[PDB]
């Protein structure tokens, strides 16, 4: 193989694993063209996004099919469904594989010959291959032991000119910094306890948020046992990871444990092999959101207030009732020490394969995969009202505006059960004739995927702190859910070959899906690929390799479960910041479901065209790969937005084409190569063009992907790229000038929201170098992604709270918005006049909260960055030093990842590699005070026995 006719990239485990990330995928961030890999956050155990040649699924499955040996792997993600108030992320299914077990990873990027793995392969395929057997010297035990620290990478750049206050006036209790310019004078602050109050010099504490963090620590232990014979091999491994990240206390926690055992035995023509793996994880998360969460509470601090001085709870002034500010936030050390959001998961997966060769040229293969997971969430928060409301300022002293109302406690638990089964029966035929070569494959596929869970919640805790379903004198809330889907297919793949110069492949697959209408389950998709190596049978010896590539083909797809028939739900009503649910009052009720089913659905069909060129020179000391692709995903079934006046808010129908076109370019060479020293350079370049082509006209040409009510929202619009943003901009006169309010000075909102950019990078690229001098290695990779925009609540809260350096704009003196007019409206006469009204000192706080002249759009932030992704310094010890020792090899290794990030002038707020909305499409909307990203660096010891 590498008679392939479309883009693919091979990486061996040593590159996968040298980075010592807990995860098989995050090390490859920015190292492979057309493969956009990103982490959801720096929080331990969180998910990893991997999008291949853009987004095709409008909602919302764009990860590639992970295939392990080679059985599909479950890649389900566990993250919060309300990112605004309780954001958290607990991992995705691929994060479970142990990188130390990977021999080879091969990423199939194109979607024109996917007959082997089925519909899920249109999103691309990540083929992993795990290590097998020896013989070697001597016993076959490899240990990897690691230790690494994480510190905070980029916090927003703050103003240190003005302190606690509002309206530019001094205050003793604000969650913000619109006070006077720093005096050094002694002023009061905080609440009053026992007729006493704290008194401090009015100065800035620029390190206060930075000092709040610790150093994350992580220790890893990995072992493996290996051996083989001429008829058999055996591999058995174990990995352990325990992360307590940089946010104080143990709320950033991730414990990973894996165990694997893989064997193969050959007896004649028969080969039976088997792989079985168990995975454990315990995630704990420092919850994000706009309420009583840690980071939201942390950003809402005056520039003069000492944060680390708030951790001592034996200081009454830090107790929740006397905390220095009562404005929708709480003592961050209380929230981390007293809230709960834990996840524990147990997972078993594996495969059985029976190979049997017969009649010279044939081979029968039966392969069966099973992957099952039991996960269990436990979240809780105290009855803040019972504990702290009566008698305190923060408190009864706030009445209905107290952060303790109605915070009466809550505790929920959920147990999820996932299960997928895959079965393949195949027959292969491989026979050479007169320089030709024939390879046929006929197969059957059978798939069964099932998820269910059981949820149960109690509110209003009797004992304030105990988190148990017994601890409430009120009704408990229960929910139960289950989905099941089945698929069967038959496929064939014909490989034609002439003299290792002309390679041809024809793929065909027909599937029958349970999620399509009964009268239309069957879809067929063919493909064709070609490869012409004009190197061979072209003298020199200057051209090591020269291969030209082309592909055209289709991959069909079905829909998500239960989208054909109408349902009736238990009646509920979604109101702002709440619900009204049945039963009421003693009566149960059912309501007509808001998503109109459809039995006219037809299958989805992705069609792709691709051509590519691969050449090497000077004995592989120069090498480049270029691909050009044109991808159209059509008839994708999607719950399309609809006018509620129709009786439904969405209708399931086949969409139009989502198009992804672009260029994938890779260039590498070895400019210097001696006996003891080599220097390599690698440069890879991706540019993708995204365009929704049509969305069914009859319902409008627009549909929400994610978005705030009356706030910034990300759409899919007909003739525009995936992920268009709209946000409130200010009104302008026909001549460009900004309209402001005659009386306040503040900008005036335009009539409609303005389009404000899309989610997509205009281009992506990475540059690597690798030095080897005798035993020493060095690797330096840069990630470069440019273009696009994302919503950032970190800029939002720091504008509003008066803490971002931008808000110090005019030395906070009364100011007239430059270029301002007033719109003089008399009935239907519109007239514009130079604006004379200043924004007063007392109202400047509101100018910036709303987003200055930019209004809401101010908080769409540029996605672009250059990143020092990773640096790995390896020292393989000379084999001579190990001789009177039990050791076969020893490699010490120092490394660092996510080390430094460079953003354009306009973004001084976030590491753009952030979300609160998951690892797929909806995550691209932005970050909702996701926790700060971290800088990671450690050591690793490798010891072969």
């Amino acid at each position: 193989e590498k008679a392939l006719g479309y883009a693919a990239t091979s990486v061996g485990g040593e590159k996968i694993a040298e980075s010592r990330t807990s995860d098989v995928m995050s090390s490859l961030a920015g190292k492979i063209a057309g493969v956009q890999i990103s982490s959801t956050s720096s929080d331990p155990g969180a998910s990893n996004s991997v999008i291949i040649r853009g987004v095709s699924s409008l909602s919302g499955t764009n990860q590639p099919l992970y295939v392990v040996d080679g059985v599909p792997l479950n890649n389900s993600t566990v993250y919060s469904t309300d990112g605004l108030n309780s954001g958290y992320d607990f991992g995705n299914g691929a994060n479970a594989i142990n990188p130390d077990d990977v021999a080879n990873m091969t990423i199939l990027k194109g979607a024109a010959a996917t007959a082997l793995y089925g519909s899920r392969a249109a999103n691309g395929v990540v083929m992993i291959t795990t290590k097998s057997g020896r013989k070697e010297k001597g016993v076959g035990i490899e240990y990897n032991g690691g230790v690494q620290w994480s510190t905070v990478l980029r916090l927003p750049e703050f103003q240190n000119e003005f302190g606690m206050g509002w309206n530019g006036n001094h205050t003793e209790l604000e969650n913000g910094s619109w006070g006077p310019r720093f005096d050094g004078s002694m002023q009061l602050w905080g609440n009053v306890y026992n007729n006493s109050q704290k008194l401090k010099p009015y100065v800035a504490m620029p390190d206060n948020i930075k000092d709040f963090f610790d150093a994350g620590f992580r220790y890893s232990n990995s072992l493996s046992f290996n051996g083989a014979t001429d008829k058999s091999d055996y591999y058995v491994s174990f990995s352990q990871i325990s992360d307590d990240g940089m946010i104080p206390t143990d709320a950033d926690s991730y414990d990973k444990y894996t165990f694997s055992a893989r064997g193969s035995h050959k007896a004649g023509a028969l080969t039976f092999s088997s792989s079985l793996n168990y995975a454990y994880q315990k995630n704990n998360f420092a919850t994000t959101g706009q309420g009583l969460s840690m980071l939201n509470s942390l950003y809402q601090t005056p520039r003069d207030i000492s944060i680390i001085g708030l951790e001592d709870q034996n200081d009454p002034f830090n107790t929740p009732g006397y905390y220095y500010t009562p404005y929708g936030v709480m003592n961050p050390y209380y929230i981390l020490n007293n809230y709960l959001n834990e996840y524990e998961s147990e997972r078993f997966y594996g495969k059985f394969q029976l190979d049997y060769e017969f009649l010279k040229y044939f081979k029968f293969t039966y392969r069966m995969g099973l992957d099952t997971t039991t996960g269990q969430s436990d979240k809780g928060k105290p009855n803040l009202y019972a504990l702290y409301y009566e008698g305190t300022p923060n408190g009864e002293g706030q009445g209905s505006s107290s952060p303790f109302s109605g915070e009466t406690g809550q505790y929920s638990e959920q147990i999820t059960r996932r299960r997928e089964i895959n079965q393949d029966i195949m027959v292969n035929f491989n026979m050479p004739v007169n320089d030709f070569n024939i390879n046929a494959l006929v197969g059957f596929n059978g798939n069964e995927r099932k998820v269910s869970y059981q949820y149960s919640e109690v509110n209003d805790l009797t004992i304030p702190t105990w988190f148990n379903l017994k601890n409430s004198g009120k009704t408990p809330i229960v929910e139960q859910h289950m989905e099941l889907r089945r698929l069967m297919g038959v496929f064939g793949q014909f490989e034609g070959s002439w003299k290792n110069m002309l390679y041809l492949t024809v793929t065909a697959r027909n599937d029958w899906s349970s999620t399509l209408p009964k009268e239309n389950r069957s879809f067929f998709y063919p493909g064709i690929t070609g490869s012409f190596i004009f190197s061979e049978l072209l003298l020199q010896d200057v051209i090591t390799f020269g291969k030209i590539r082309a592909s055209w083909g289709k991959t069909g797809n079905d829909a998500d479960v239960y989208m054909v028939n109408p349902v009736y739900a238990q009646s509920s009503n979604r109101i702002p910041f709440g619900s009204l649910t049945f039963p009421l009052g003693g009566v149960n009720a059912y309501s007509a479901g808001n998503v109109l089913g459809s039995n006219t659905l037809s299958p989805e069909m992705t069609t792709e065209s691709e051509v590519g060129l691969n050449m090497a020179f000077f004995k592989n000391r120069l090498s480049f790969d270029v691909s050009y692709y044109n991808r159209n995903t059509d008839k994708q079934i999607f719950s399309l937005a609809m006018d509620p006046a129709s009786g439904y808010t969405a209708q399931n129908m086949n969409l139009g084409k989502i198009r992804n076109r672009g260029i994938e370019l890779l260039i590498s060479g070895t400019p210097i190569r001696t006996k003891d020293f080599s220097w390599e350079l690698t440069w890879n370049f991706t540019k993708n063009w995204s365009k929704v082509i049509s969305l069914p006209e009859e319902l409008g040409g627009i549909t929400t992907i994610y978005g705030l009510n009356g706030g910034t929202s990300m759409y899919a619009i007909t003739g525009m790229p995936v992920g268009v943003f709209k946000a409130q901009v200010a009104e302008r006169d026909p001549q460009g000038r900004i309209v402001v309010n005659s009386s306040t000075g503040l900008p005036v909102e335009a009539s409609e929201f303005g389009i404000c950019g899309d989610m997509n990078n205009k281009y992506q690229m990475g540059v690597s170098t690798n030095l080897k001098y005798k035993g020493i290695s060095l690797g330096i990779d840069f990630d470069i992604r440019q273009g696009g925009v994302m919503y950032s609540r970190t800029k939002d809260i720091n504008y509003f709270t008066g803490n971002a350096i931008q808000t110090a704009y005019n030395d906070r003196n009364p100011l007239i918005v430059p270029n301002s007019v007033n719109k003089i409206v008399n009935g239907e006469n519109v007239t514009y006049v130079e604006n004379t009204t200043p924004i007063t000192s007392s109202n400047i706080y509101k100018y910036w909260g709303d987003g200055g002249s930019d209004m809401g759009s101010c908080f769409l932030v540029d996605k672009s960055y250059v990143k020092l992704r990773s640096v790995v310094l390896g020292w393989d010890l000379p084999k001579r030093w190990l001789a009177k020792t039990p050791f076969q090899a020893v490699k010490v290794s120092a490394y660092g990842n996510n080390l430094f990030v460079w953003t354009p002038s306009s973004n001084t707020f976030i590491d753009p590699e952030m979300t609160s909305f998951g690892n797929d499409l909806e995550g691209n909307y932005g970050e909702y005070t996701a926790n700060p990203s971290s800088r990671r660096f450690g050591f690793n010891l490798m010891v072969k026995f």
């Binding site: 509002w166 969650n175 913000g176 929400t704 992907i705 978005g707 009356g710």
Partner: peptide, 10 residues
Amino acid sequence: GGGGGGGGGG
């Protein structure tokens, strides 16, 4: 689109 958010104290 769906979800909504609060404002702040001040």
